[PDB]
Amino acid sequence: VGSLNCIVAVSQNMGIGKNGDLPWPPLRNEFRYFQRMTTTSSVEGKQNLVIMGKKTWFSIPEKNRPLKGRINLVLSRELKEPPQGAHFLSRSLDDALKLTEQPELANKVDMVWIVGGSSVYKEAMNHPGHLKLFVTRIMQDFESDTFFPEIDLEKYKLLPEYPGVLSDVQEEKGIKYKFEVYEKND
Ligand SMILES: NC(=O)C1=CN([C@@H]2O[C@H](COP(=O)(O)OP(=O)(O)OC[C@H]3O[C@@H](n4cnc5c(N)ncnc54)[C@H](OP(=O)(O)O)[C@@H]3O)[C@@H](O)[C@H]2O)C=CC1
Ligand SMILES: Cc1c(Sc2ccc(OC(F)(F)F)cc2)sc2nc(N)nc(N)c12
C-alpha cells in the first residue's frame, strides 16, 4: 500500500455539507478533479482505495456508486455488511487501514484516499504519520451543517506546487475556488 491522503472541498466558513448534500451548487470541474485525483494510480496493476463514512456514501448519487475504478470502503458500526454497491465495510479507521495490509488487499491497493466526512477526517488528521490533505478552497461562505476539522498549520505545510494540480483561481457558476495540497509527517 502507498500513501494516505484526505481530499475535501470546503467553503470559507469551513463548511463541507448541508442536509446530506454539498453547501454550494454543483461545480462540474471540481467533481472532475475529485474523480481524477482519487482514481489516478502511478503503480501499474493497482487501484486506489477510497474510505468514507456511511453518510458520505449515501450522499453520492446512486448512479455514481461505487466510485468507479476505485476500491470502495465504508465505515460504520451499525451496518452488518457493506451497502449495495460498496466493496468493503470496516468498524473503525484503524480497522480499515489494517485490512489494507491483509493478503486480500496488500498487493491490490496503491493510494488510500479518505473522502469524508468530518469525524473520519478529524481522526486521520490527528493520528501520527505521513499524510497529505488535498483541499479545494471554495472562496465564499455557504450555509452548512457539517464542517471540516481545523488544519494545524504548524504540522501541515501548504506545498508551493504539486504536479497535476492547477495553481490559479478557478471559477464555475460564479463561484471562485482554488486547489491546495498540505503535507505533514509526524
Ligand atoms: N465537501 C466535501 O468534500 C465533502 C462533503 N461531504 C458532505 O458532508 C456530509 C456527510 O458527512 P458527515 O455527517 O460528516 O458523515 P460521515 O460520512 O462521516 O458519516 C458518519 C457515519 O459514518 C459512520 N462512521 C463515521 N466515522 C466512522 C468511523 N471512524 N468508524 C466507524 N463508523 C464511522 C457512523 O455511522 P454508524 O452510526 O453506522 O456507525 C457515522 O454516523 C454530507 O453533507 C456530504 O454531502 C462528505 C464528504 C466530503
Ligand atoms: C466527497 C466529495 C464530493 S460528493 C461526490 C458526488 C458525486 C460523485 O460522483 C460524480 F460522478 F463525480 F458526480 C463523486 C463525489 S465532491 C468532493 N470534492 C472534493 N474535493 N473532495 C471530496 N471528498 C468530495
Side-chain angles (χ1 to χ4, degrees), residues 7-9 22 30-31 33-34 56 60-61 64 67 115 121 136:
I7 181 158
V8 66
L22 298 200
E30 210 288 315
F31 286 112
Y33 171 82
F34 166 84
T56 295
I60 296 163
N64 288 324
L67 293 178
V115 309
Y121 289 136
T136 301

Coordinates of all heavy atoms in Angstrom, one line a residue, residues 7-9 22 30-31 33-34 56 60-61 64 67 115 121 136, ligand 2:
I7 N -9.0 14.1 0.9 CA -9.4 15.1 -0.1 C -10.8 15.6 0.4 O -11.7 14.9 0.8 CB -9.5 14.4 -1.5 CG1 -9.8 15.5 -2.6 CG2 -10.4 13.2 -1.6 CD1 -9.3 15.0 -4.0
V8 N -10.9 17.0 0.2 CA -12.2 17.7 0.6 C -12.3 18.9 -0.2 O -11.3 19.5 -0.7 CB -12.0 18.1 2.1 CG1 -11.0 19.2 2.4 CG2 -13.4 18.5 2.7
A9 N -13.5 19.4 -0.4 CA -13.8 20.8 -0.8 C -14.5 21.4 0.4 O -15.5 20.9 1.0 CB -14.7 20.8 -2.1
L22 N -23.8 18.9 -0.8 CA -22.8 20.0 -0.7 C -23.5 21.3 -0.4 O -24.7 21.5 -0.8 CB -21.9 20.0 -1.9 CG -21.0 18.8 -2.2 CD1 -19.9 19.2 -3.1 CD2 -20.4 18.1 -1.0
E30 N -14.9 20.7 -10.4 CA -14.4 20.3 -9.1 C -14.7 18.8 -8.9 O -13.9 18.0 -8.4 CB -15.1 21.1 -8.0 CG -14.3 21.3 -6.7 CD -14.1 20.1 -5.8 OE1 -15.0 19.3 -5.6 OE2 -12.9 19.9 -5.4
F31 N -15.9 18.3 -9.3 CA -16.1 16.9 -9.2 C -15.2 16.1 -10.2 O -14.7 15.0 -9.8 CB -17.5 16.5 -9.7 CG -18.7 16.7 -8.7 CD1 -19.6 17.7 -9.0 CD2 -18.8 16.0 -7.5 CE1 -20.7 18.0 -8.1 CE2 -19.8 16.3 -6.6 CZ -20.7 17.3 -6.9
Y33 N -12.1 17.0 -10.9 CA -10.8 17.0 -10.1 C -10.9 15.9 -9.1 O -9.9 15.1 -8.9 CB -10.6 18.4 -9.5 CG -9.4 18.5 -8.6 CD1 -8.1 18.6 -9.1 CD2 -9.6 18.3 -7.2 CE1 -7.0 18.6 -8.3 CE2 -8.4 18.4 -6.3 CZ -7.2 18.5 -6.9 OH -6.0 18.7 -6.2
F34 N -11.9 15.9 -8.3 CA -12.0 14.8 -7.3 C -11.9 13.4 -7.9 O -11.1 12.5 -7.4 CB -13.4 14.9 -6.5 CG -13.8 13.7 -5.7 CD1 -13.3 13.6 -4.4 CD2 -14.6 12.7 -6.2 CE1 -13.5 12.5 -3.6 CE2 -14.8 11.6 -5.4 CZ -14.4 11.5 -4.1
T56 N -21.5 9.9 4.0 CA -20.8 10.2 2.7 C -21.2 9.3 1.6 O -21.5 9.7 0.5 CB -19.3 10.4 2.9 OG1 -19.1 11.5 3.8 CG2 -18.6 10.8 1.6
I60 N -23.5 10.2 -2.2 CA -23.1 10.2 -3.6 C -24.3 9.6 -4.3 O -24.9 8.7 -3.9 CB -21.9 9.2 -3.7 CG1 -20.7 9.7 -3.0 CG2 -21.6 9.0 -5.2 CD1 -19.6 8.6 -2.7
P61 N -24.7 10.3 -5.5 CA -25.8 9.8 -6.2 C -25.6 8.3 -6.5 O -24.5 8.0 -6.9 CB -25.8 10.7 -7.5 CG -25.1 11.9 -7.1 CD -24.1 11.5 -6.0
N64 N -23.5 7.0 -9.3 CA -22.1 7.3 -9.3 C -21.4 6.3 -8.3 O -20.2 6.5 -8.0 CB -21.8 8.7 -8.9 CG -22.1 9.7 -10.0 OD1 -22.0 9.4 -11.2 ND2 -22.6 10.8 -9.6
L67 N -17.8 4.5 -6.4 CA -16.9 5.4 -7.2 C -16.1 4.5 -8.2 O -15.3 3.7 -7.7 CB -16.0 6.2 -6.2 CG -16.9 7.3 -5.5 CD1 -16.0 7.9 -4.5 CD2 -17.7 8.2 -6.3
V115 N -12.3 10.3 1.9 CA -13.1 11.2 1.2 C -14.3 11.8 2.0 O -15.1 12.5 1.3 CB -13.6 10.7 -0.2 CG1 -12.5 10.1 -1.1 CG2 -14.7 9.5 0.0
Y121 N -12.2 12.5 8.8 CA -11.1 13.5 8.5 C -10.4 13.8 9.9 O -9.2 13.8 9.9 CB -11.7 14.7 8.0 CG -12.2 14.7 6.6 CD1 -13.4 15.4 6.3 CD2 -11.4 14.2 5.5 CE1 -13.9 15.4 5.0 CE2 -11.9 14.3 4.2 CZ -13.1 14.9 4.0 OH -13.5 15.0 2.7
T136 N -9.8 21.7 -1.6 CA -10.3 22.8 -2.6 C -11.0 23.8 -1.7 O -11.9 23.6 -1.0 CB -11.3 22.2 -3.5 OG1 -10.8 21.1 -4.2 CG2 -11.8 23.3 -4.4
Ligands
LIG2 C1 -17.0 13.5 -1.4 C2 -16.7 14.7 -2.3 C3 -17.7 15.1 -3.2 S1 -19.5 14.3 -3.3 C4 -19.4 13.3 -4.9 C5 -20.6 13.2 -5.6 C6 -20.7 12.5 -6.8 C7 -19.5 11.9 -7.3 O1 -19.6 11.3 -8.5 C8 -19.5 12.2 -9.7 F1 -19.5 11.4 -10.7 F2 -18.1 12.9 -9.7 F3 -20.8 13.2 -9.7 C9 -18.4 12.0 -6.6 C10 -18.3 12.6 -5.3 S2 -17.3 16.4 -4.2 C11 -15.7 16.5 -3.4 N1 -14.7 17.3 -3.8 C12 -13.6 17.1 -3.2 N2 -12.6 17.9 -3.5 N3 -13.3 16.2 -2.2 C13 -14.4 15.4 -1.8 N4 -14.1 14.5 -0.8 C14 -15.6 15.4 -2.4

